[PDB]
Amino acid sequence: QRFVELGWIDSTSPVNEQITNPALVEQIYHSNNDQLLWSDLATANHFEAQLEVIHRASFSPLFSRQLFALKSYRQQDRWHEYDVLATDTLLQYLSYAEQAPKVGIAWFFEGQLDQPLAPPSEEAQLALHMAIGNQSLARLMDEYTPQDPAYQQLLQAYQSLSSIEFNEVALYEQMERLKRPGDPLSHREALVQRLALVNLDTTSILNDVAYYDASLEKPIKQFQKMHGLQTDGVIGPQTMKWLNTSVTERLALLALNAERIRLWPTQQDSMIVVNVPGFDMKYWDAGREVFESKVVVGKTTRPTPVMNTKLDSLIINPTWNVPHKIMVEDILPMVKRDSEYLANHHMEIIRGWSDPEVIDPALIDWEAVEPETFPYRLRQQAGVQNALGTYKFNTPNSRAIYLHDTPSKHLFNNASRAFSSGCIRVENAEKFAQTLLANQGITLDDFPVSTQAIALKKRIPVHIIYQTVWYEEGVLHYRDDIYHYDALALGN
């Protein structure tokens, strides 16, 4: 324990304080007659490269501390010490790969991977022993990466971009806040370089021009689409901010988003995914994408949490039992200010559960009511102008986060859609409800008169994801860090 039992590691050696699992490390060494496992320089490079990705992503002080210790040992040609720590670090790496899809949320969105992980599984240790036997350690590492080809495509682009990282490229500058098509451009050189850096087709852009010509109109709009901006062709502050992004900032985002896929690595055949920073969702039935929709997500002050839930059921013409927190902070203040707020929003005051007692307002002294002490509940009646619209998609969980229709459809016109108190508002709620029921053969004979709860035959897994970079139709897409979760990897 306190000292790893190998002849070639001195008891004085600092690797004895850096090794997380001395017993398992000894097991691996003893079963290879205590020889070096990292003698082949290609294998040690591939592992450092993969650890560099973890480092850049900035979610793991553990993997960062180990990586720099390893680099230190390599600088000083202390290859014995490099070997042991590398073996120990590969065990942590295998645990990481196995545990990410189980408790990963904690490392990327609640805290950090600071403390050593529990040993990897028996199956993983066996896989390790055989990889050593066959001199296939690199292949072992690659096998313990996500199934999704989205991982590979993100890492390819990372590699390409890593090579040209520290090449100088002028900041794009303009003096007029907005440049439209036809307007003169001071810095058209930088503009086109920076369109090229994100792998847009730059070939058909004219070289000798010095204004916003026809040949830029498609490229700028495509750049705007790639970043979830309004494709209005106007080079504004939003376009410029993304243009002037460094390659080291882009590599941070790629690294972080690559490793994030380990938290949602499988595509199930039946599935619902909401990408918060992309403000959209998709529903897969039977391995086939059957439904897509823009969504509204929680505001920055009441964010939609990243989580896994299940959809069990669906309410048509739902009522809205107003959560306590929303009654005190939002509704009651306004009710004190507007005698007729409740009548306009068809809300009632309730003192009961299941068979509740409808309380008459104005029999309360509203000026004397303190929101936090108010003892009753609020309930909004079913109707087209209900906050849940005509459909609530029940995804029970401890945070009371679910999906629902909305009467406020104009919110879908905005590019950034962090407006709600946490729940996910679905644009095509009607089509979504139709598809859910069809795919379980639960279609309604007739549209319900009023409130109808429909239980699903099979629960559908719901993944609420935070992925600010992904691969779509041959290019990488990017999204604003709406909840500031990828801020640490940018240096902010």
CA separation (Å) from 321 to 154, 325, 392, 399? 43, 12, 12, 15
- Exposure class string for 129-166: b at 16+ Cβ within 10 A, else e: eebbeeeebbebbeebbbebebbebbbebbeebbeeee
Helices and strands (H and E) in the chain: how many:
17, 15
CA atoms of 54 and 251, how far apart (whole Å): 11
Q: What's the rounded Cα separation, in Å, for the pair 480 and 90?
A: 34
Rg over alpha carbons for the chain, rounded to the nearest Å, is: 28
Give which of 427, 422, 362, 434 is closest to 398, Cα–Cα.
Answer: 422
Residue pair 183/176 in contact (Cβ under 8 Å)? The answer is: yes
Supply φ then ψ for residue 271, to 5 degrees: -165, 150
Chain center to CA of 484: 11
Q: Which helix (H) or strand (E) holds 294?
A: strand 288-298
Name the burial class of residue 491, with classes exposed (0-12), middle (13-18) and buried (19+) by CB atoms within 10 angstroms of its CB. Answer: exposed
Closest CA to 470 of 285, 161, 288, 256: 256
Resolution to one decimal, Å: 2.3
Distance CA 27, CA 31 (A): 6
Dist CA 451 CA 440 (whole Å): 20
**Tokens encoding 8:** 């070639």
Are 15 and 9 a contacting pair, CB within 8 Å?
yes
The sign of the torsion formed by the CA atoms of 394, 395, 397, 402 equals negative
Q: What is the DSSP string of 30-41?
A: HTTTT--S--SH
Query: How far apart (Å, rounded) are the C-alpha atoms in residues 97 and 146?
Result: 8
Q: Which two tokens stand for residue 173?
A: 């500058």
First to last CA, the chain: 39
* Strand pairing category for 377-380 and 347-350: antiparallel
- The answer to whether the CB of 475 falls within 8 A of the CB of 226 is yes
Residue 475 phi, psi dihedral angles, 5° rounding:
-135, 160
Virtual torsion, Cα 327, 331, 337, 339, nearest 10 deg: -90
Domain that holds residue 232: 186-248+486-489
Q: Supply the CATH number for residue 223's domain.
A: 1.10.101.10
